[PDB]
Design a protein around this ligand. Structure first.
Ligand SMILES: *C(=O)/C=C/c1ccc(O)cc1
Length: 125
């Protein structure tokens, strides 16, 4: 298992160094998005939470297609504010309930180290 803790101050530095295989060793869910919300990476721990097969969601749009419950000012609105301002770093609780048993999570969104892609980190609560 990779040793990186959810919510770490320098998490984006650690994950910039990791390939796909290593992302799958994280203890929490990790999704990498572009600025339009298209899914670039989606790890195994996230699929364990949500029942989605990573291979099938990569390339889809997270807010339009995969996770409509996150199309809300509270989630998608904060994402788009952070993409526009260049300072995305926020943590909040949320419920995921589209085609799945409703599941409470903690979400951390953070800009990636290079600044042109964005992470969504998820763990159960
Ligand atoms: C709400 O529709 C949430 C859906 C969801 C969240 C996260 C995922 O990785 C997949 C689906």
């Amino acid at each position: 298992m990779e040793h990186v803790a959810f919510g770490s101050e320098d998490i984006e530095n650690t994950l910039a160094k990791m390939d796909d295989g290593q992302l799958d060793g994280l203890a929490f869910g990790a999704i990498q998005l572009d600025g339009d919300g298209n899914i670039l990476q989606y790890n195994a721990a996230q699929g364990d939470i949500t029942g989605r097969d990573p291979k099938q969601v990569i390339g889809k749009n997270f807010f339009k297609d995969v996770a409509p419950c996150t199309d809300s000012p509270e989630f998608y609105g904060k994402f788009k504010e952070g993409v526009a301002s260049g300072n995305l770093n926020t943590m909040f609780e949320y419920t995921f309930d589209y085609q799945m048993t409703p599941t409470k999570v903690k979400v951390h969104m953070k800009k990636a180290l290079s600044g042109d892609s964005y992470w969504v980190f998820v763990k159960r609560v």
